[PDB]
Design a binder for this molecule. Structure first.
Ligand SMILES: CC(C)CCC[C@@H](C)[C@H]1CC[C@H]2[C@@H]3CC=C4C[C@@H](O)CC[C@]4(C)[C@H]3CC[C@]12C
Ligand SMILES: CC(C)CCC[C@@H](C)[C@H]1CC[C@H]2[C@@H]3CC=C4C[C@@H](O)CC[C@]4(C)[C@H]3CC[C@]12C
Ligand SMILES: CC(C)CCC[C@@H](C)[C@H]1CC[C@H]2[C@@H]3CC=C4C[C@@H](O)CC[C@]4(C)[C@H]3CC[C@]12C
Ligand SMILES: CC(C)CCC[C@@H](C)[C@H]1CC[C@H]2[C@@H]3CC=C4C[C@@H](O)CC[C@]4(C)[C@H]3CC[C@]12C
Ligand SMILES: CC(C)CCC[C@@H](C)[C@H]1CC[C@H]2[C@@H]3CC=C4C[C@@H](O)CC[C@]4(C)[C@H]3CC[C@]12C
Ligand SMILES: CC(C)CCC[C@@H](C)[C@H]1CC[C@H]2[C@@H]3CC=C4C[C@@H](O)CC[C@]4(C)[C@H]3CC[C@]12C
Ligand SMILES: CC(C)Nc1cc(-c2csc(N(C)C(=O)c3ccc(F)cc3)n2)ncn1
Ligand SMILES: CC(C)Nc1cc(-c2csc(N(C)C(=O)c3ccc(F)cc3)n2)ncn1
Ligand SMILES: CCCCCCCC/C=C\CCCCCCCC(=O)OC[C@H](O)CO
Ligand SMILES: CCCCCCCC/C=C\CCCCCCCC(=O)OC[C@H](O)CO
Ligand SMILES: CCCCCCCC/C=C\CCCCCCCC(=O)O
Lengths: 366, 360
């Protein structure tokens, strides 16, 4: 029985605490190794319907591989004579029991796909991905047409890729926390927005520099210059997010905010959110400055007025996200809607007018 | 404890079998009602992580609502004096335990999204839906262009609609059996293929009729109406079967040790719509072969002919694979996506290339 195998495991760890000889550790470790392997070959009833080679069933067994591996490390020091170092390894076994195996042994709550809020979020993302791919295809098909050629094409592609990845974020956020889902959400949430606003601050800054009324040919105006500038700004976020993923490796952890419920969530720190959020905020603030400066520019069917109201909305979304995310226990769904709403604003305000002039009024397109 | 509540439930049902008085039934029913309500308020360990208002948790409690409701029906007949009719209600309670609750109490096997075969199937369907929506958009954008206008646009929309729906089928088939998923797969598997082969049998019949004063039923409306009547035969056939054989998730016992959660779809529920689709494919192939060397519309008829020979082989292979092996869900999944993929691939890839790669 797996319920009694976990009892032998816990009671033998207590023997290490009150150990006053080498024989009281070696016996309690060998007995613990056999009790851990007996629990590994078992299946918890919440995984009884799952395939023996399902990701959860693989992760369940892997938790015991770490644990049995740690028992081998403790028996190495004990058989050597260094029983003092083997005694300290007992506390390392307790932390393993919580971070890899406990989630499979106690009732753990987490955000399901079944929840109305996550059904709305994923339904909205499917529409988002569909409309984004629709927009992208029209942009690609009407490549050489004067409506799309006149704007920064390569930069609009980065914006669309950022918007697309923005709609992918809820799938990684609503998915039951796994090392992979925790990795991807940190990467995708940080970079999706950074891609949009890195290309947008490049686009709007270029528009602000264009605002000038013999002369000299202006630099960093080229399509390649724009892509390079945007790429350096995105790479700042990529460096920031990846460095944090390295020093704070993504993991599913058990949170205890409620007195009765145990919640399975990602181990993402405040720093893991504030550092990339602050950089996205820096881009959104830079964007809005240039968007406002050029709000009344009538060039490209009042393209600038649409960027301006995209930016005022994004500012409000960002400003609302900080107290909602840091002041409430709705962190997953808040992130979901902050990303999906901010990217919908951009897709809607910035691309719907262009689509209209292309797929509904092609006489004004020429 | 829910494990001991199910013990009281089973042992009191045994008392009804060996009952030789009205007192031995009334006591065993009241004791069973209290034991059922005690099990309903509980949570099985495979649902311990689930929200109390999750679909599984709701369906778990609903199984006891039927069961407690049945105990009320049996106590109605027992208190009346008709203990003979109340005794028969004990066998009706055993089925309720099986068809609605047992799946949450015993380890049950079913096809999960985690399986490599269903990962491939869903990955292939996502590409399918994407390519289908890509094709549809090009068809819609290049509406008035001579390549798409010369054809039956409205019928191609039916073909693509059926093809799209063909790729939607694996999502309903791989999803853990629920009443909804069982309804949707019967509807979608039957109608997806019927949409494709009704619009195609109409298209190819026309091509074959052209092979020869003004000919009738040649119009864009006539084609859509003819296709719609043929689809409605499948819709009538599938819905009538859904009515006389309501879709439900049930526990199958093909393996001596493994219990499977599957949809209660009968051989008839598969053979009747499969046979009609087979009739449509056979009719299609007849006309496709008859007009295999027609050079009109960039050898349009050649692509249909090959599409039809492949679809015949897929259908002919589906019957012994589906009826002769325990790979019924994944077989349906690939029979539908593969047959739809030949149509999308063979018939629409050249149409794209002659629009988006070779604009004359
Ligand atoms: C283009 C837009 C409008 C389509 C959106 C995609 C739709 C079809 C998807 C996205 C989210 C989906 C839901 C995801 C979660 C659940 C919970 C599950 O237990 C039952 C099905 C249900 C309720 C899904 C049904 C289909 C759904 C509504
Ligand atoms: C045309 C486009 C919009 C349709 C494609 C929808 C994509 C986003 C869907 C289709 C099938 C989906 C997967 C189906 C199975 C699972 C199992 C669950 O444990 C985690 C989510 C995961 C991994 C899903 C995530 C989203 C998914 C990849
Ligand atoms: C019309 C098309 C393009 C819509 C997009 C694809 C649909 C079918 C996808 C998108 C997201 C998907 C869902 C995402 C994740 C899960 C969780 C898993 O535990 C059960 C299936 C379920 C609920 C998926 C079923 C299929 C799904 C609803
Ligand atoms: C072209 C479009 C339709 C493809 C987009 C597919 C997206 C939605 C895919 C690509 C990789 C995917 C993820 C791969 C890994 C995991 C970890 C797993 O434990 C839960 C699901 C999750 C988080 C997946 C969900 C869906 C996902 C984010
Ligand atoms: C590129 C085109 C063909 C679209 C492909 C969509 C891809 C990205 C989707 C479709 C189905 C998906 C898978 C559905 C189920 C699972 C099981 C889950 O526990 C881990 C992720 C994994 C393995 C998903 C990864 C992403 C996936 C492979
Ligand atoms: C908008 C139109 C044209 C496309 C149809 C949308 C499709 C993709 C949606 C709508 C309703 C959906 C289903 C609703 C119910 C269930 C039952 C559940 O056990 C898992 C998912 C499953 C099987 C869904 C899968 C996706 C689904 C079939
Ligand atoms: C644990 C999970 C649930 N939470 C997260 C969140 C983040 C994260 C990183 S950056 C960001 N930004 C900028 C916005 O959400 C944002 C962007 C633009 C706006 F207009 C409004 C808001 N969010 N990273 C990791 N984990
Ligand atoms: C129990 C579950 C798993 N199986 C099903 C199957 C059906 C069903 C209805 S019609 C059909 N056809 C025609 C094909 O599958 C078909 C179509 C074209 C081909 F080339 C080959 C085969 N299948 N309906 C409900 N449930
Ligand atoms: C902008 C970067 C934000 C960095 C500030 C992070 C503040 C925080 O919450 O982290 C704890 C802090 O690093 C103390 O050890
Ligand atoms: C119209 C032709 C119908 C073709 C469908 C033939 C199905 C064969 C069949 O009825 O299957 C028997 C199986 O052994 C039962 O389990
Ligand atoms: C044609 C459609 C079938 C494609 C479906 C994909 C895999 C099906 C594999 C089933 C093999 C039958 C097993 C027979 C046997 O075990 O002897």
């Amino acid at each position: 029985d797996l319920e009694d195998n976990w009892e032998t495991l816990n009671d033998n760890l207590k023997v290490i605490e009150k150990a006053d000889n080498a024989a009281q550790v070696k016996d309690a470790l060998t007995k613990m190794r056999a009790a851990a392997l007996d629990a590994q070959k078992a299946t918890p009833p919440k995984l009884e319907d799952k395939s023996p080679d399902s990701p959860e069933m693989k992760d369940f067994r892997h938790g015991f591989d770490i644990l049995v591996g740690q028992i081998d490390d403790a028996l190495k020091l004990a058989n050597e004579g260094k029983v003092k170092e083997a005694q300290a390894a007992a506390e390392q076994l307790k932390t393993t029991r919580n971070a890899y195996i406990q989630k499979y042994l106690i009732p753990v709550r987490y955000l399901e796909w079944s929840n109305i809020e996550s059904i709305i979020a994923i339904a909205f993302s499917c529409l988002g991905i569909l409309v984004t791919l629709f927009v992208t295809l029209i942009f690609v098909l009407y490549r050489d047409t004067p409506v799309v050629k006149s704007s920064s094409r390569e930069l609009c592609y980065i914006i669309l890729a950022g918007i697309f990845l923005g709609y992918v974020c809820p799938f990684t956020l609503i998915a039951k926390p796994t090392t992979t889902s925790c990795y991807l959400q940190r990467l995708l949430v940080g970079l999706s927005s950074a891609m949009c606003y890195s290309a947008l601050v490049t686009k709007t800054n270029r528009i602000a520099r264009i605002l000038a009324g013999c002369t000299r040919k202006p630099r960093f105006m080229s399509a390649w210059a724009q892509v390079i500038i945007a790429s350096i700004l995105i790479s700042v976020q990529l460096t920031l997010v990846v460095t944090l993923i390295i020093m704070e490796p993504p993991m599913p952890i058990l949170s205890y905010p409620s007195i009765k419920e145990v919640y399975l969530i990602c181990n993402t720190s405040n720093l893991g959110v504030v550092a990339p959020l602050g950089y996205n905020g820096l881009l959104i603030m830079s964007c809005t400055y240039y968007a406002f400066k050029t709000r009344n520019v009538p060039a490209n069917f009042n393209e600038a007025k649409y960027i301006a109201f995209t930016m005022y909305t994004t500012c409000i979304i960002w400003l609302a996200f900080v107290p909602i995310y840091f002041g409430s226990n709705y962190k997953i769904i808040t992130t979901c809607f902050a990303v999906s709403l901010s990217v919908t604003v951009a897709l809607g305000c910035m691309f719907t007018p262009k689509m209209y002039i292309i797929i509904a009024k092609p006489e004004r397109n020429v």
